[PDB]
């Protein structure tokens, strides 16, 4: 019906980089991490995903809303 190969993997994958404790990630550090790894994640592509994720106050980003909208729409 509606798999969750990305949702579950995204929530879990991000969880590994949890800092806030509740379930958030810093875009500042998250940028260098992802870009520095994988297939050299572009700085532009990472800037978009993080911008739509949330980013409030300093740089807190909940991977629940980000993943939610990522699949919800």
């Amino acid at each position: 019906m509606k798999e969750q190969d990305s949702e579950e993997e995204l929530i879990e994958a991000f969880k590994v980089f949890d800092r806030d404790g509740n379930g958030l990630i810093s875009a500042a550090e998250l940028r260098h991490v992802m870009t520095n790894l994988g297939e050299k994640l572009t700085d532009d592509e990472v800037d978009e995903m993080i911008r739509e994720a949330d980013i409030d106050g300093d740089g807190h980003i909940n991977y629940e809303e980000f993943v939610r909208m990522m699949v919800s729409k």
Partner: peptide, 27 residues
């Protein structure tokens, strides 16, 4: 003490690929 951090970073990277794509079929 395997760096599982990078691993999760690979799969999550795949999500971004689908994210940028997904919402982009026609009109």
């Amino acid at each position: 003490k395997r760096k599982q951090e990078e691993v999760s970073a690979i799969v999550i990277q795949r999500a971004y690929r689908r994210y940028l794509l997904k919402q982009k079929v026609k009109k």
